[PDB]
């Protein structure tokens, strides 16, 4: 299981969420991006470790506020996947909102 | 342009997506089904109206969560095509996964 496979599942969810709620502006994207991330983080420890081993994600947090102060190592790793997803989905936000708007024409 | 012509294009895409990623289980089909649907929805208003006029699709949604709360009528119609595609492709999921698995023999 790789970070690229997890990111593809999150990107597809956000695409769906955009259509289901007719989202047109980045200022209304926060919750859709975070649900997509939540729905894409792996659940099994083994998949979480495999994702951390693959291309596209490092161990350091960008914002330490999204890092839990906890002794549970697996939660720290899950929180890091969750954070990278949200960052990468935000970089595709404008592109995705344009593709949605542009998919019909009279 | 008819719903049957749109569905044929989506069915063929999902068939391709199954081969390209060696998909073997329905629990791994979600994203392939939704991409196929997305790629098959018509873009021109006229084709969207012609599809709604043809055999195989009604105006009511099965899950209202897939219906956007919006004043844009054309988006509501597109969302209904998208939903019917996903429903009909899910009814063919097992059949398609069996045809893929069964296409080779030693
Ligand atoms: Cs890595
Ligand atoms: Cs914290
Ligand atoms: Cs991008
Ligand atoms: Cs009809
Ligand atoms: Cs909705
Ligand atoms: Cs069927």
From Swiss-Prot, chains A, B:
Consequence of changing residue 49 to D: Partial loss of inhibition of the host exclusion defense system BREX
GO biological process, one term: symbiont-mediated suppression of host innate immune response
Keyword presence, Ribonucleoprotein: no
Keyword Protease (UniProt): no
InterPro entries, sorted: B-form_Ocr, Ocr
One Pfam match: ocr
Disulfide bonds: none
Keywords tagged on the record: Early protein, Host-virus interaction, Inhibition of host innate immune response by virus, Restriction-modification system evasion by virus, Viral immunoevasion
Subunit structure as annotated in this protein's UniProt entry: Homodimer. Interacts with HsdM (AC P08957), the M subunit of host type I methyltransferase restriction enzyme M.EcoKI; 1 Ocr dimer binds to M.EcoKI. Interacts with HsdR (AC P08956), the R subunit of host type I bifunctional endonuclease and methyltransferase restriction enzyme R.EcoKI; 2 Ocr dimers binds to R.EcoKI. Interacts with host PglX/BrxX (AC P0DUF9); this interaction inhibits the enzymatic activity of PglX/BrxX through high-affinity binding. Forms a 2:2 tetrameric complex with phage T7 OCR.
Primary role: Prevents both degradation and modification of T7 DNA by the host restriction-modification complex. Structural mimic of the phosphate backbone of B-form DNA that binds to and completely occupies the DNA-binding sites of all known families of the complex type I DNA restriction enzymes. Thereby, inhibits the restriction endonuclease activity and protects the phage genome as it penetrates into host cytoplasm. Inhibits host transcription by binding to the bacterial RNAP and competing with sigma factors. Inhibits the host exclusion defense system BREX.
Name listed for the protein in its UniProt record: Protein Ocr
Native source organism of the sequence: Escherichia phage T7
